[PDB]
Amino acid sequence: MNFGAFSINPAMMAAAQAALQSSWGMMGMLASQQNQSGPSGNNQNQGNMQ
């Protein structure tokens, strides 16, 4: 009973999240892919753990 005058749900936060994806969303993608490169070699003739 009674409408949600000032009471709201985090739907705007979700829409903002999608929009914030530029800074925040790609941040996780950028970090989680580990662009920093964990292996110190990479430029190595042999080294793929096989």
Curated annotation (Swiss-Prot):
Please describe the post-translational modifications of this protein. Answer: Hyperphosphorylated in hippocampus, neocortex, and spinal cord from individuals affected with ALS and FTLDU. Phosphorylated upon cellular stress.
Where is this protein localized, as stated in its record? Answer: Nucleus; Cytoplasm; Cytoplasm, Stress granule; Mitochondrion
Domain of life according to the entry: Eukaryota
Tissue expression as described in the entry: Ubiquitously expressed. In particular, expression is high in pancreas, placenta, lung, genital tract and spleen.
Task: Region Disordered: list its residue ranges.
Answer: 31-50
Instruction: Return the Low complexity bias intervals.
Output: 32-48
Name the cystine pairs.
Answer: none
Task: Provide the effect of residue 21 to K.
Answer: In ALS10; triggers mitochondrial DNA release into the cytosol, which is then detected by CGAS, leading to activation of the cGAS-STING pathway and autoinflammation; impedes the development of normal limb and tail buds and increases the number of apoptotic nuclei when expressed in chick embryos; does not affect the interaction with ATXN2
Description of its domains: Consists of an N-terminal domain (NTD) and two tandem RNA recognition motifs, RRM1 and RRM2, followed by a C-terminal glycine-rich region.
Q: How does it assemble?
A: Homodimer. Homooligomer (via its N-terminal domain). Interacts with BRDT. Binds specifically to pyrimidine-rich motifs of TAR DNA and to single stranded TG repeated sequences. Binds to RNA, specifically to UG repeated sequences with a minimum of six contiguous repeats. Interacts with ATXN2; the interaction is RNA-dependent. Interacts with MATR3. Interacts with UBQLN2. Interacts with HNRNPA2B1. Interacts with ZNF106. Interacts with CNOT7/CAF1. Interacts with CRY2.
| Described purpose of this protein according to its UniProt entry | RNA-binding protein that is involved in various steps of RNA biogenesis and processing. Preferentially binds, via its two RNA recognition motifs RRM1 and RRM2, to GU-repeats on RNA molecules predominantly localized within long introns and in the 3'UTR of mRNAs. In turn, regulates the splicing of many non-coding and protein-coding RNAs including proteins involved in neuronal survival, as well as mRNAs that encode proteins relevant for neurodegenerative diseases. Plays a role in maintaining mitochondrial homeostasis by regulating the processing of mitochondrial transcripts.
> What disease is associated with this protein?
Amyotrophic lateral sclerosis 10: A neurodegenerative disorder affecting upper motor neurons in the brain and lower motor neurons in the brain stem and spinal cord, resulting in fatal paralysis. Sensory abnormalities are absent. The pathologic hallmarks of the disease include pallor of the corticospinal tract due to loss of motor neurons, presence of ubiquitin-positive inclusions within surviving motor neurons, and deposition of pathologic aggregates. The etiology of amyotrophic lateral sclerosis is likely to be multifactorial, involving both genetic and environmental factors.
Query: What is the name of this protein?
Result: TAR DNA-binding protein 43
Source organism per UniProt: Homo sapiens
Q: Which residues of the full protein are shown?
A: 311 to 360 of 414
